[PDB]
Every structure is written in structure tokens, then in C-alpha cells.
Amino acid sequence: SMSVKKPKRDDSKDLALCSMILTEMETHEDAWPFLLPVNLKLVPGYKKVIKKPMDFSTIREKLSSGQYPNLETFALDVRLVFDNCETFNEDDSDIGRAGHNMRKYFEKKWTDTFK
Numbered sequence: 001s002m003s004v005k006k007p008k009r010d011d012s013k014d015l016a017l018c019s020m021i022l023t024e025m026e027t028h029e030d031a032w033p034f035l036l037p038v039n040l041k042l043v044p045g046y047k048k049v050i051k052k053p054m055d056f057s058t059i060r061e062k063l064s065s066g067q068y069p070n071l072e073t074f075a076l077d078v079r080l081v082f083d084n085c086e087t088f089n090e091d092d093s094d095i096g097r098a099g100h101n102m103r104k105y106f107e108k109k110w111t112d113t114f115k
């Protein structure tokens with residue numbers, strides 16, 4: 001509360017560390033369904049069903065332009081990619097499987113780096 005703070009966690013490296021994690025996502029061989037925005041004109045239903053589209057290149061652009069206030073807002077966008085994927089894709093598809101794999105991959109890098 002006012003004049004009462006927890007000890008200050010060092011957050012000066014967070015921007016750089018998030019960039020590294022994102023680089024490792026981008027270079028994963030199962031990254032291909034998530035590298036660019038889903039084409040809202042060539043995929044029937046996507047625009048209407050998925051209210052908040054997100055993809056790695058958009059995350060990269062937001063990261064590089066100071067649009068994430070903190071660590072956590074970055075992780076929310078990453079998770080949004082895989083939540084969107086689960087909403088639109090059957091678990092038993094290549095894209096469905098890519099999503100589960102990538103989420104797992106992310107959550108480990110996340111835990112190892114910050115938790």
C-alpha cells in the first residue's frame with residue numbers, strides 16, 4: 001500500500017529475455033502455423049469467431065515497439081496464440097498438434113527463465 005512495498009524484483013533484463021524466448025518460438029519447426037497473422041480473407045469464419053487474433057510476428061512488433069507494459073502482458077499474447085489455435089482447430093490435426101507442442105515448449109522456457 002502507500003509507502004509499503006515488497007522488495008523490488010529486478011526487471012531490467014525482461015525485455016531482452018522475452019525477445020530470446022520469442023526467437024526460440026519463431027525457430028521451432030512447429031512454428032509455421034503461428035509465424036504470420038491468419039489470412040482473414042482466405043480462411044472462412046476466422047474473423048467472426050476469433051475476436052482477438054494474435055501471431056508471433058505481431059507479438060514481435062509489439063515487443064520491439066514498447067507495447068508490452070510488463071512480462072505478464074507478453075505471456076498473455078503468447079498464450080492467446082495457442083488459445084485461438086485450440087478454439088479453431090481440432091486437436092487431431094497438424095495445426096492442432098502444433099499448437100499443443102508450442103504451448104508446452106513456451107511454458108517450460110517461461111518457467112525456467114522467470115520462475
Ligand SMILES: Nc1nc2ccc(Cl)cc2s1
Nearest residue numbers: 033034038043085088095
Ligand atoms: N494458427 C493457425 N490457425 C489456423 C486456423 C485455420 C487455418 Cl486454415 C489455418 C490456421 S494457422
Ligand SMILES: Nc1nc2ccc(Cl)cc2s1
Nearest residue numbers: 032033034036037038039
Ligand atoms: N498464417 C497462416 N495462415 C494459414 C492459413 C492456412 C494454412 Cl493451411 C496455414 C496457415 S499459416
